[PDB]
Design an enzyme around this catalytic site. Structure first.
Site, mmCIF file in Angstrom:
data_model
loop_
_atom_site.group_PDB
_atom_site.id
_atom_site.type_symbol
_atom_site.label_atom_id
_atom_site.label_comp_id
_atom_site.label_asym_id
_atom_site.label_seq_id
_atom_site.Cartn_x
_atom_site.Cartn_y
_atom_site.Cartn_z
ATOM 1 N N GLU A 179 17.165 -20.894 25.075
ATOM 2 C CA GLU A 179 16.249 -22.027 24.885
ATOM 3 C C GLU A 179 15.087 -21.621 23.962
ATOM 4 O O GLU A 179 13.907 -21.697 24.348
ATOM 5 C CB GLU A 179 15.750 -22.569 26.237
ATOM 6 C CG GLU A 179 16.900 -23.072 27.106
ATOM 7 C CD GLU A 179 16.488 -23.718 28.407
ATOM 8 O OE1 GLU A 179 15.321 -23.580 28.843
ATOM 9 O OE2 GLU A 179 17.351 -24.352 29.030
ATOM 10 N N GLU A 220 24.484 -22.960 30.080
ATOM 11 C CA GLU A 220 23.697 -23.141 31.306
ATOM 12 C C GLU A 220 23.851 -24.530 31.856
ATOM 13 O O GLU A 220 23.656 -25.521 31.136
ATOM 14 C CB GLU A 220 22.219 -22.888 31.041
ATOM 15 C CG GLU A 220 21.549 -22.096 32.170
ATOM 16 C CD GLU A 220 20.062 -21.938 31.920
ATOM 17 O OE1 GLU A 220 19.670 -21.050 31.153
ATOM 18 O OE2 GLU A 220 19.290 -22.749 32.483
#
Ligand SMILES: OC[C@H]1CNC[C@@H](O)[C@H]1O
Length: 848
Positions: A428, A509
């Site tokens: 991220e 994820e």
């Protein structure tokens, strides 16, 4: 003549455990820490690893905030003195740290060897030139700093992983010097497989030497599979290094795979000769496997198609804090494997040696992740500030930034481990937006890896794909990767797949369902980021709570299952971890200090979704099973009002991999139900319940106290599994449940002993929170207590008077006992006010 026995002794002696006999002091004076003959009477004598933060009380004012577990950091010194044996006086000496959190300095005999910012990457120093002459005592001092906030999860502080010492000849295989490749394995596997080996050899002497390398491959814990293969003798000049090469052939090797639980592993033995004398010998672990990945069919391993049934895992072990331990990580990874997990993602940092070894041993594929941030940072004292700074490590190459150096050394460390199949260069990363800086950066990092290793998928975990339709500048970053990880982006998969038909896609994820063990709420509803005061800092074990950006286990799994081009997922998370207590994130005055995301709690106790996953991922042939939820104690009106339907019935659900489940209440059938068998668009067979959103079978049961029993059956109607739940009476006793009858007496092995609050008939009381007090006698050491409750602010460690206590939570908790180096036994006794006490005894002694 040098016998094989002598070679194996040389290998063993080359590397030693350097964890013993350290001194620790928080806020120690720098000058006392580094100096000879310091007064250590005010220092704590200990054996590593040691995470100092886990011993703190929780602090509502902690600068870590609750995301970091509200456990303070600070700064400390560790100090150790040692002498080289007479015979080792002229040897090269290297000190390896598997992990020090963080911003560390290592001093040897008063002089600074190196400063190393990274809190998770392994690093090592050649300390030879810093040691005293003639075998006089040497002083190592390590400064570790955890200035908060530095993390989005509990990091721990200090030397939380092993430290090892390598003592070698001046001519030796350099650190991470071995490369082992099997480039034609798929083609050669039914005959002789060429195994290409490379050794980076260093001559640290000031004289030239004649160099020969000799190799043999052996099955790990098995026999030789080659003879000795020798390189041509050549000069290696003083202070110079070289790469030697050989090819060895191994006939029909057993292939490493996730499809069994003790996969085949091999070791390369390297023998190094200086002027015809054997001076260095080592082994390197590896395996034989090949894999392939296509856009529309996803992944295959050794020719067999699989999906990544994966979990993301943080490094902490609950009551152990950041302290890495082989037995703790073994328990955890074996537990994931019992669930049907075949892969793991080390979110979001380099893995310990234990993690990597155990994955290879148990058959788990690994994505090892280098970075949680690039140059931007996410927390002020995290790695971001170091990312583009010049690396000052004494062995860094010219022009290497910390990110270059850390990424390179991580890859060089793990390049022969058969379990690792992906390198992630970021999770991220907000700044990886496709601008010129981020584009340059992604190509630089990809290239650092490819210069060492081309056999593994370079990847990233990206949540940018979930916003809007998922398109944007970040797509240019994804284009540079071997495989593109989607974080929480199922909703845009179909569109992104049509746009980028050549991408290798998977869920880097997923889910972030939030759950508290044994707590139940509104099973008829999906609850989104539900954090009101009516929740009492708990989330629902029905699996119906998920965060705003998340999905339930069912929604995230069914999507993956239905789409062949989405190669698998890494669920957030396989186990709970300290910190990040979303959906109460950084609400610092609330009690919460540990996560809700885990399939399993921090105490190692599965939540119900563990069995949902097991039912999906473990074949009925391998492990037929059935699991019921919730409990059957519904006397409490407040508890029951949150669960019962409009008719006041309890929704009782069964997860099973069988054909049918029949539920009985007090011996009376409530009806047999049968899973619907279905096929994916590409012909894969699966089971579901009453509709596509239910993977369980359900009964609405009018509450009558007693026994619920589920009979699971195959298609022919034969019973293949059962489960049962019983209404408990009042607490009457504490019961202890041993996981191990015995452990090794090596001061490292440990054991998990569960405690349960039981009624007088031995039924677990599912709502019980009784305080338990522990005594330990004999050859053991208490090292943790936990109940997994997110809102708990109880100590994981000893109380300030030396006592060990912990409440049960929803009937249960665990105590963790470490062995000593003396054989014998230890006895754990548990007491609780007005309840019967209990004890168990665990033996200690020989390993294996
Ligand atoms: O839902 C929580 C997760 C989001 N993705 C990154 C993880 O480290 C964690 O914060």
């Amino acid at each position: 003549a040098v016998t094989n026995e002598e070679v194996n002794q040389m290998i063993e002696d080359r590397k030693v455990d350097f964890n013993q006999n350290w001194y620790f002091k928080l806020n120690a004076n720098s000058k006392e820490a580094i100096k000879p003959d310091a007064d250590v009477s005010t220092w704590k004598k200990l054996d590593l690893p040691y995470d100092w933060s886990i011993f703190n009380d929780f602090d509502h004012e902690s600068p870590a905030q609750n995301e970091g577990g509200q456990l303070n950091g600070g700064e400390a010194w560790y100090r150790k003195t040692f002498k080289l044996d007479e015979k080792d006086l002229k040897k090269n000496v290297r000190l390896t740290f598997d992990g020090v959190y963080m911003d560390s300095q290592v001093y040897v005999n008063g002089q600074l060897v190196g400063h190393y910012p990274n809190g998770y990457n392994q690093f090592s120093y050649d300390i030879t030139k810093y040691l005293q002459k003639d075998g006089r005592e040497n002083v190592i001092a390590v400064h570790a700093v955890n200035k908060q906030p530095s993390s989005r999860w509990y990091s721990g502080s200090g030397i939380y992983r092993d430290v090892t010492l390598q003592v070698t000849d001046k001519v030796h295989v350099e650190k991470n010097g071995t490369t082992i490749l099997t480039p034609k394995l798929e083609e050669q596997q039914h005959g002789k497989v060429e195994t290409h080996v490379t050794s980076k050899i260093v001559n640290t002497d000031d004289k030239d030497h004649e160099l020969v390398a000799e190799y043999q491959i052996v099955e790990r814990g098995g026999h030789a599979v080659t003879g000795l293969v020798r390189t041509a003798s050549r000069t290696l000049k003083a202070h110079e290094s070289t790469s030697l090469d050989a090819i060895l052939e191994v006939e029909r090797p057993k292939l490493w795979t996730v499809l069994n639980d003790k996969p085949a592993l091999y070791e390369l033995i390297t023998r190094v000769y200086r002027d015809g004398q054997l001076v260095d010998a080592k082994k390197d672990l590896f395996g034989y496997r090949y894999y392939h990945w296509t856009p529309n069919e996803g992944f295959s391993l050794n020719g067999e198609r699989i999906k990544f049934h994966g979990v993301s895992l943080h490094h902490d072990h609950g009551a152990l804090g950041a302290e890495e331990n082989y037995k703790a990580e073994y328990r955890r990874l074996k537990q994931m494997k019992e669930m049907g997990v075949n892969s793991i993602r080390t979110t979001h940092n380099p893995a310990s040696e234990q993690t990597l070894q155990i994955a290879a041993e148990l058959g788990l594929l690994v994505q090892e992740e280098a970075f949680d941030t690039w140059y931007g940072g996410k927390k002020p004292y995290d790695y971001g500030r170091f990312f583009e700074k010049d690396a000052t490590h004494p062995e860094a190459r010219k022009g290497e930034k910390w990110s270059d150096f850390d990424l390179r050394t991580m890859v060089e460390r793990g390049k022969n481990n058969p379990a690792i199949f992906m390198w992630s260069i970021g999770n991220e990363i907000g700044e990886a937006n496709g601008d010129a800086h981020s584009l340059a950066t992604v190509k630089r990092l990809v290239k650092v890896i490819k210069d060492v290793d081309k056999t593994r998928y370079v990847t990233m975990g990206a949540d940018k794909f979930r916003f809007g339709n998922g398109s944007g500048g970040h797509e240019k970053i994804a284009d540079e990767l071997d495989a593109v990880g989607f974080n929480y982006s199922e909703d845009n998969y179909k569109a992104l797949r049509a746009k980028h038909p050549k991408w290798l896609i998977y869920g880097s994820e997923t889910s972030s369902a939030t759950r508290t063990r044994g707590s139940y709420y509104r099973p008829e509803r999906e609850l989104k980021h539900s954090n009101g005061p009516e929740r009492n800092y708990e989330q629902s074990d029905y699996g119906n709570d998920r965060v705003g950006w998340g999905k339930t286990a069912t929604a995230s799994w069914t999507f993956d299952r239905d789409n062949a081009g989405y190669a698998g997922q890494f669920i957030w998370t396989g186990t709970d971890y300290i910190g990040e207590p979303t959906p109460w994130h950084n609400q610092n005055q609330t009690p919460v200090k540990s996560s809700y995301f885990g399939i399993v709690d921090t105490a190692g106790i599965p939540k119900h979704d563990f069995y949902l996953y097991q039912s999906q991922w473990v074949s009925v042939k391998k492990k037929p099973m059935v699991h019921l939820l919730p409990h059957w104690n519904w006397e409490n009106k407040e508890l029951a009002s949150k669960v019962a339907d409009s008719e006041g019935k309890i929704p009782v659900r069964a997860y099973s991999n069988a054909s049918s489940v029949e539920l009985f209440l007090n011996g009376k059938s409530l009806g047999l139900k049968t899973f619907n068998k279905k096929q994916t668009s590409d012909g894969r067979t699966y089971q579901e319940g009453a509709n596509a959103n239910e993977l369980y079978l359900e009964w609405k049961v009018a509450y009558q106290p007693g026994t619920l029993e589920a009979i699971a059956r195959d298609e022919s109607g034969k019973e293949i599994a059962r489960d049962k739940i019983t209404t408990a009476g009042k607490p009457a006793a504490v019961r202890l449940i041993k996981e191990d009858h015995a452990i090794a007496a090596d001061g490292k092995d440990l054991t998990y002993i569960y405690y349960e609050i039981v009624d007088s008939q031995g039924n677990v009381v599912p709502t019980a929170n009784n305080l338990v007090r522990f005594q330990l006698h004999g050859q053991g050491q208490l090292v943790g207590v936990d109940n997994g409750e997110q809102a708990s602010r109880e100590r994981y460690k000893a109380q300030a008077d030396g006592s060990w206590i912990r409440k049960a939570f929803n009937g249960k908790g665990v105590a963790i006992v470490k062995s000593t180096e003396q054989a014998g036994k230890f006895t754990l006794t548990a007491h609780s006010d007005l309840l019967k006490s209990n004890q168990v005894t665990v033996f200690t002694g020989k390993k294996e």
